From a paper:
The presence of threonine (T) at the 8th position (Nef126-10(8T10F)), representing Nef mutation I133T, did not significantly affect epitope-HLA binding compared to the wild type isoleucine (I) (Nef126-10(8I10F)). In order to examine the impact of these mutations on epitope structure, we solved the crystal structures of HLA-A24/Nef126-10(8I10F) and HLA-A24/Nef126-10(8T10F) at 1.66 Å and 2.0 Å resolution, respectively. Superposition of the Nef126-10(8I10F) and Nef126-10(8T10F) peptide structures showed almost similar backbone atoms, with root mean square deviation of 0.307 Å, but conformational differences were found at P6 (131P) and P9 (134R) residues. In addition, the B-factors for the central portions (P5-P7) of each peptide (41.5 Å2 for the Nef126-10(8I10F) and 46.2 Å2 for Nef126-10(8T10F)) were higher than for overall peptides (24.1 Å2 for Nef126-10(8I10F) and 33.2 Å2 for Nef126-10(8T10F)). These results indicated a flexibility of the central portion and P9 residue in both peptides, accounting for the structural difference observed. The side chains of P8-Ile and P8-Thr protruded from, rather than being buried within, the antigen-binding cleft of HLA-A*24:02, suggesting the P8 residue could be involved in the contact with TCR. Therefore, different TCRs could be favored by the presence of either hydrophobic P8-I or hydrophilic P8-T at the interface of a TCR-HLA-A*24:02/Nef126-10. If this is the case, different TCR repertoires would be selected by Nef126-10(8I10F) or Nef126-10(8T10F), suggesting Nef-I133T as a possible immune escape mutation that alters the in vivo repertoire of CTL recognizing this epitope. Nine out of 10 patients with Nef126-10(8T10F) viruses exhibited specific responses to the circulating epitope, and 7 of 10 patients retained the response specific against Nef126-10(8I10F). These results strongly suggested that the I133T mutation induced a new subset of CD8+ T cells capable of recognizing Nef126-10(8T10F) (p = 0.005, Fisher’s exact test).
Numbering used by the authors:
A (entry chain C): 1 to 10
B (entry chain B): 0 to 99
C (entry chain A): 1 to 274
């Protein structure tokens, strides 16, 4: 299973 | 930025038996950046139906790829892979040796 | 033994030729099982192992959703990095990410990962405690402060000890004939005369799984590294791996040498003698 969101930007 | 030269191996899936179906592999590993070109060669000419694995990388972030084709080795047919990458001054050719 | 699940992603910018290409792959131990390529027509996560094909449509939708969102994030991250470093828009850059988890031999969580590299060098990584970050430079320090404020560590930790582990356990069971097998190395030796004075002994390991292996030459019991050639472990294409190790031997001294093989599929290390 892939990591869920949300992604946080650099 | 950073650059790493590919390690190149060309080899068969199974020990070579003349006249018997096999797979010819070219494994390129430990390189960076990811753009790389590989041909498999039969008697100096490009083999057409070459496939490759999905781009992946190792613990040190360096990339690796397997290029492969079905082939039938014979006593006299000459096989090779040819590799180009930004780190190489010219395409590098490595002849297939059934014993490495 | 222990097992791991890993996702590896690569984003490469291509100035003047459109948006960056994003490729992600998923692995259980040394077995690939999914891929996504932003350049491909499907625009879906795709199966790359037989045992994953039994997952239903909701799996494929949700996994595609997550990896597409990643692709967009890393596209943004490539732009952010350029600005942080004040690098030219005319140059191509690479952003790589790795995440996943290890479990032990009875399926308990062992370790989790979440890290990035920019142009082949570590940028930022979740430390083993899953509570704090290591930043490689002043640019990653900015990212570190942001991720600290946003509580990214605890969000990823919940994933890594929860969903990551559950999925890995599920895959290990569904692909148990594939994934929970060990394939011991088939071993042999070949001889190659160099001159009247020298010959090469090559020690082979073939058809083994997983890829982790050790091959050592000894002379008279002494660990021999001087005059040994060792190739990188290479995939056979059929799910198994190959490796060899060679030594140049004074003609007639072949019997002094032993090849030593260690692998998880071997109950005891092997010693081979010509």
């Amino acid at each position: 299973n892939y990591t869920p969101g949300p992604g946080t930007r650099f | 930025m950073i650059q790493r030269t590919p390690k190149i191996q060309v080899y068969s899936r199974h020990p070579a038996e003349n006249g018997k179906s096999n797979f010819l592999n070219c494994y390129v590993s430990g390189f960076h950046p990811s753009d790389i070109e590989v041909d498999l060669l039969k008697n100096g000419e490009r083999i057409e139906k070459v496939e490759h694995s999905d781009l992946s990388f190792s613990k040190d972030w360096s990339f690796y790829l397997l290029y492969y084709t079905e082939f039938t080795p014979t006593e006299k047919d000459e096989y090779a892979c040819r590799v180009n990458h930004v780190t190489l001054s010219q395409p590098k050719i490595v002849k297939w040796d059934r014993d490495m | 033994g222990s097992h791991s699940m890993r996702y590896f992603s690569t984003s490469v910018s291509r100035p003047g030729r459109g948006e960056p290409r994003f490729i992600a792959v998923g692995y259980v131990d040394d077995t690939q099982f999914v891929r996504f390529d932003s350049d491909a027509a499907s625009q879906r996560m795709e199966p790359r192992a037989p045992w994953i094909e039994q997952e239903g449509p909701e799996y494929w939708d949700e996994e595609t959703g997550k990896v597409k969102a990643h692709s967009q994030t890393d596209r943004e991250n490539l732009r952010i990095a350029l600005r942080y470093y004040n690098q030219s828009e005319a140059g191509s850059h690479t952003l790589q990410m790795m995440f996943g988890c290890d479990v032990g031999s009875d399926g308990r969580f062992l370790r989790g990962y979440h890290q990035y590299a920019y142009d082949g060098k570590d940028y930022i990584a979740l430390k083993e405690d899953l509570r704090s970050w290591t930043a490689a430079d002043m640019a990653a320090q900015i990212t570190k402060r942001k991720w600290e404020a946003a509580h990214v560590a605890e969000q990823q930790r919940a994933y890594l000890e929860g969903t990551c582990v559950d999925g890995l356990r599920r895959y290990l069971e569904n692909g148990k004939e594939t994934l929970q097998r060990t394939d011991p190395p088939k071993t042999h030796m070949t001889h190659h005369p160099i001159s009247d004075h020298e010959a090469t002994l090559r020690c082979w390991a073939l058809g083994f799984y997983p890829a982790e292996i050790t091959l050592t030459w000894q002379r008279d019991g002494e660990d021999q590294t001087q005059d040994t050639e060792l190739v990188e472990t290479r995939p056979a294409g059929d799910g198994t791996f190959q490796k060899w190790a060679a030594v140049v031997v004074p003609s007639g001294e072949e019997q002094r040498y032993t090849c030593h093989v260690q692998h998880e599929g071997l109950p005891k290390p092997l010693t081979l003698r010509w």
